[PDB]
Amino acid sequence: GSSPAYLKEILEQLLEAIVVATNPSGRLISELFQKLPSKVQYPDYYAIIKEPIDLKTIAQRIQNGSYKSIHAMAKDIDLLAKNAKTYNEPGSQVFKDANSIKKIFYMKKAEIEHHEMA
């Protein structure tokens, strides 16, 4: 089984793929997902979203050793995207970027596993 250090490297690879990704315009897809919305500016968000999460939290979990599997990080990516697609609307940039983050994450997860299988 993967050591904590080996797992950390894998999770860091997955996170980096998300945070460096750009749209055609050159804008970072991850920009609005790094930190949760301000509680002062978005009290509606916190009334609506049961378990908020951002990339800062996910990064902290990677650094602290709180994930014990890749699947555990995947569940948090699912949550991140689901929340964004609940608060914002289909066709909005945040909604689109949430789906983009999910695609980037799952593609990289598949690639990492594929390499492990030979």
Return d(Cα 67, Cα 56) in angstroms, integer: 14
Experimental method: X-ray
| HEC-encoded secondary structure of 8-43 | HHHHHHHHHHHHHCECCCCCECCHHHCCCCCCCCCH
What's the rounded Cα separation, in Å, for the pair 1 and 3?
6
> What's this structure's resolution in Å?
1.5
Domains, the chain, in order of start with CATH, read 1-118 (1.20.920.10)
End-to-end, the C-alpha distance of the chain in Å comes to: 16
The continuous run of DSSP H or E covering 82 comes out as helix 70-87
Contacts for 35 with CB less than 8 Å, ≥ 6 apart:
54, 55, 56
Contact 17, 105 (CB under 8 A): yes
